[PDB]
Amino acid sequence: MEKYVAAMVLSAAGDALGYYNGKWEFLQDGEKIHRQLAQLGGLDALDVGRWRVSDDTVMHLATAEALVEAGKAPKLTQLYYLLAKHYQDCMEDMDGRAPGGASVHNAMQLKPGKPNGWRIPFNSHEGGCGAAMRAMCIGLRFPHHSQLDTLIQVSIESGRMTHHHPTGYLGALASALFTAYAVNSRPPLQWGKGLMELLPEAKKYIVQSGYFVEENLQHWSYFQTKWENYLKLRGILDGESAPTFPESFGVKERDQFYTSLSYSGWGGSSGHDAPMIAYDAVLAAGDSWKELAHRAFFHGGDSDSTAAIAGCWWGVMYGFKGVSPSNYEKLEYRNRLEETARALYSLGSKEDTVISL
């Protein structure tokens, strides 16, 4: 129970903490964020009562609520109607939340109701993190090994309702997949290898689905190459070694590393690097919420987004252990988050099968 509740609540807490009503998301100097954090009394002193969640939580809740509404043994046509509907409707709750461009534009284009009304054309600039930031609960719903093909399909299609570009929707796959791994207590050092092994199954799905096959295949290597290079850097390509971090890896060094991971200069703003930064933070932090926050919530990149992902994976594994109550007790939508988590638990914690397209 607690771990699903923590998954949803701490994902949202991370989003709020990284965001700081826009002040910290858009600060590009991680050292300055850390100084302002110290002046506020440090992470344990932060009270989120007045720290709004951003687009990341509003969309993650929208994915979660659609999964709960679709119920047991759902038809994927029904689940995709609900997802499209929630994604479109939730754009009405983005005031002061700094929504991402593909997210807001394409959610408002959707036509749920029409057969395939949730599909959009391939686009060269739909590689943002907006698909990845809202996908983690898919793993909460479909954690069992038997459901892997379902997790792959739903993460991908949920993503390309707004991000029809492998760098975008493969980020959704990573977010959902690593959540499932966390639910099953798979050691985090194994997770990157799991993703690499499953990319060919994601391709099989994209190919057979039959939409913009050539464009998808032509853009496929970016995601896979960036992840391979990252896993090799950490010494974890094959999932059979503890990670190795650089000697000098303080706040400034991490800002620089995150920028190096990035597509166009804003670290964690894409489908490849949002989950990658969250993962790097989980790997280093272990059971330390504070270390997780310092690495995934407070940096010069797209920090609420890396936070939303990291906080979900971490809460799944550790619950609320060692988290200051002020970091979540008065969090926006706390009640909706807890209620959806419990309903996802009831669905997720007993293995069922979907009716495919």
Ligand X SMILES: Nc1ncnc2c1ncn2[C@@H]1O[C@H](COP(=O)(O)OP(=O)(O)O)[C@@H](O)[C@H]1O
CA of residue 217 relative to chain centroid, distance = 23
Give the list of residues 6+ apart from residue 289 with CB closer than 8 angstroms, or none. 10, 43, 314, 318, 321, 322, 323, 327
Among 25-33, 103-111, 153-161, 206-214, the segment contacting K ion (CB under 5 A): 25-33
Among 42, 101, 121, 325, binds Cl ion (CB under 5 A): 42
User: Does 270 appear as a known binding residue?
Assistant: yes
The answer to whether 116 and 129 are in contact (CB under 8 A) is no
Confirm or reject binding of residue 43 to Cl ion (CB under 5 A).
Answer: yes
Confirm or reject binding of residue 125 to ligand X (CB under 6 A).
Answer: yes
266 binds, among K ion, Cl ion, ligand X, none (CB under 5 to 8 A by kind): ligand X
Give the relative orientation of helices 273-285 and 303-318 as an angle to the nearest 10 degrees. Answer: 40
Confirm or reject binding of residue 282 to Cl ion (CB under 5 A).
Answer: no
Confirm or reject binding of residue 122 to ligand X (CB under 6 A).
Answer: no
For residue 143, give both structure tokens: 């954690």
Confirm or reject binding of residue 102 to ligand X (CB under 6 A).
Answer: yes
3-state secondary structure of 176: helix
Among 39-47, 51-59, 139-147, 215-223, the segment contacting Mg ion (CB under 5 A): 51-59
Confirm or reject binding of residue 54 to K ion (CB under 5 A).
Answer: no
Q: Is the dihedral of CA 49, 53, 58, 59 positive or negative?
A: negative
What's the min distance (Å) between Cβ of 5 and ligand X? 27
Among 49-57, 112-120, 198-206, 223-231, the segment contacting Mg ion (CB under 5 A): 49-57
- Residue 270's DSSP bridge partners are 128
248 exposed, middle or buried (CB, 10 Å; 0-12, 13-18, 19+)? exposed
10 Å Cβ neighbour count for 101? 12
Q: Under the rule (CB under 5 A), what is the footprint of Mg ion?
A: 54-56, 304
Q: Summarize as ranges the residues that interact with Cl ion (CB under 5 A).
A: 42-43
Q: Which residues bind ligand X (CB under 6 A)?
A: 100-103, 124-125, 127-130, 165, 167, 263-264, 266, 269-270
User: Which residues contact K ion by CB under 5 A?
Assistant: 27, 303
